[PDB]
Every structure is written in C-alpha cells, then in structure tokens.
Amino acid sequence: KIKIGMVTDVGGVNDGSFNQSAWEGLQRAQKELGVEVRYAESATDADYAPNIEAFIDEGYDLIICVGYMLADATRKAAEANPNQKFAIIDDASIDLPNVTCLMFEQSQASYLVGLVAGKMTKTNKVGFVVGMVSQTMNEFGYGYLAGVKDANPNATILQFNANSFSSTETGKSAATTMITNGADVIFHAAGGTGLGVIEGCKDAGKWAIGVDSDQSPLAPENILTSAMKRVDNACFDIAKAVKEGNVKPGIITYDLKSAGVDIAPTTTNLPKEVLDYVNQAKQDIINGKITVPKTKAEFEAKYGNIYELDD
Ligand SMILES: Nc1nc2c(ncn2[C@@H]2O[C@H](CO)[C@@H](O)[C@H]2O)c(=O)[nH]1
Ligand SMILES: [Zn+2]
Ligand SMILES: [Zn+2]
Ligand SMILES: [Zn+2]
Ligand SMILES: [Zn+2]
Ligand SMILES: [Zn+2]
C-alpha cells in the first residue's frame, strides 16, 4: 500500500484554513487514489524531527511537511534519508533529489482580495492580521496592500503580526482593536488565528476576508471573499505522482492561471460592480498585463513605506 504522511505545523488540522485544507486534500487522495494517509501535528518545532522520523520508520512513501517553518527539519531529514521522498509547502530553499517544493503565488490572490477590501470599505480603513512575518508571509501583505491602494488610494491599512498561527484569542483581540479604530474590512493570513479574526468581525458586524480555503461558512453574512490557496489540490497531486511513480523534485508553482490560487467561489456578498472589477484584474494578472509586487524592494518602489511589518 502507498502511504502518505503529513507533518503539520503549529496551526493544527482544525485550523479552518491551511493545515485543514492540506489534510482535506489527502483525505480526498485516500478516497480517489487508494493511498493511506495519516497526519502528525507538531506542538512546537521540537516535534518536527520526530514526527518526520515516525513516518520514515513506518515505511511511508512520501512525507509532506506543511509550512515554511519545517524547512530546516525537512532538509536535515532529507539529507539523512536519501531514499525517502519529501514534499514541503511554502518553502523553496531545499535543492535535493528527494524533495519537492510546493509553492503558491499568494501575492496574486492577496492582491485581488485587497481590491475587494479597497472597494468595500466605507471608513477607508481596512486591516491585515498576519500569523508570522517571513518572506512568504510578507507576500500576502505586499499583495493585499497593493490591491487596497490600487482600488482606493486613500485607504489606510492597519496591520498586526500575531506571532502565532494558532491563537484565536490574539486574532479576535487584534480584529476588535482594529474595528474600534475604524477598520471595517479585515483580511487575515494567519491560519487558525484567523478563526478569531473572523469571529471578531462577525461579532462587530464588519467584513472579513479569509484565506486558504473558502472560509465563508464560518461567517456567511460577514465574509466578503477568501484568498484561496489550493494546498488541498497540491497534496492530492503529489499523492497521485507518488502512486504513479513519477514524483519529481524541485519547485512546483501554483498561480492564478493554474487555478492554484484564486478568490473564493462564493461571491454572495460582493456587489456585481466589485466582482466584475476583481475578475478583470484576475484576467490581467493571468494574461501577464500586470504583475503584483512580492518583495520588499518592489513593493516600496511603488507604494513607499506603508507596510510596517517588514521593518
Ligand atoms: N509555517 C506555517 N504557516 C501557516 C500555518 N497556518 C497558516 N500558515 C500560513 O498562513 C497562510 C494563511 O493561513 C497560509 O497559506 C500559510 O502560508 C502553520 O500552521 N504553519
Ligand atoms: Zn490536535
Ligand atoms: Zn470520489
Ligand atoms: Zn489578548
Ligand atoms: Zn479540496
Ligand atoms: Zn516596511
């Protein structure tokens, strides 16, 4: 039997977003492909190495490390276990024959939801709650702020780094404070912490924007959209490659054109004018007409010092 193991990050498989979507894709892979799937949650980074080792020792054909913080542990395990195949989501630093890097152009989807936030705010203040700061996480920020400003040059983006992907209290408190200070749309790129962000928006009667999966069921009257990142499909696809015997190492990048990132399929709360505007911007990115900044220098060159979490 083909066995695929998932090592999840601190967020947990019930995060409503990143890890939950990765796991959902593996559950689908089990149903459709016949692979046997199991996950191991890591309470802290001390659990990364033994969780990887447990799948190695049990004969798993592929170990999927979900999240950029697993990179160091994945590299070390891949070097020490040349016959073991690994995949890692959201980090592309590892160049080894047994490692596939699954990357997502999240700045593209974040830009689109920033257009939504800029067009929907009535106070000209919107919020961004990020789970941690890192190169990949800042791509959410750069895209979102660029979208907000392109849609609404006079909008202010309030920003907060929760320093956790698994703290719903931090998410709720930060959202509530932003709302007290006038924000009326809040986007999170914060994993499980975002469950708190969404609850804070719902409680205050404001708009939220979710991430990774279509988070609208968590607050159907308050979610405008979500910046989708199809970690489910990427995990399914690599499971398929394992089953077929054609896993390739290196970088696989999922973008808007590949449908690997997107805005959510639920659009019930988007005015037709807004949906049309965002959909045109999506096709312009897909067709190459416009490019979203995803690094500090590119973002600052166009928007100045307005992203405060990268300094
Ligand atoms: N390293 C890591 N990143 C996460 C986690 N949860 C969310 N993220 C990131 O935050 C984004 C928004 O949830 C995801 O697409 C990931 O990039 C987690 O538990 N660990
Ligand atoms: Zn658990
Ligand atoms: Zn089926
Ligand atoms: Zn607090
Ligand atoms: Zn799915
Ligand atoms: Zn900055």
Numbering used by the authors: 45 to 355
Quote the study that presented this structure, word for word.
Clostridium thermocellum has extensive potential in lignocellulose biorefineries as an environmentally prominent, thermophilic, cellulolytic bacterium. Previously, five putative sugar transporters, denoted A to D and L and belonging to the ABC transport systems group, were identified in the genome of C. thermocellum, and the solute-binding lipoproteins (SBP) of these ABC transporters were shown to bind different dextrins by isothermal titration calorimetry (ITC) assays. To gain insight into the structural mechanism of the transporter specificities, 11 crystal structures, both alone and in complex with appropriate saccharides, were solved for all 5 putative sugar-binding proteins, thus providing detailed specific interactions between the proteins and the corresponding saccharides. Combined genetic, biophysical, and structural studies have provided solid evidence that transporter A and transporter B are the major glucose and cellodextrin transporters, respectively, among the five potential sugar transporters in C. thermocellum.
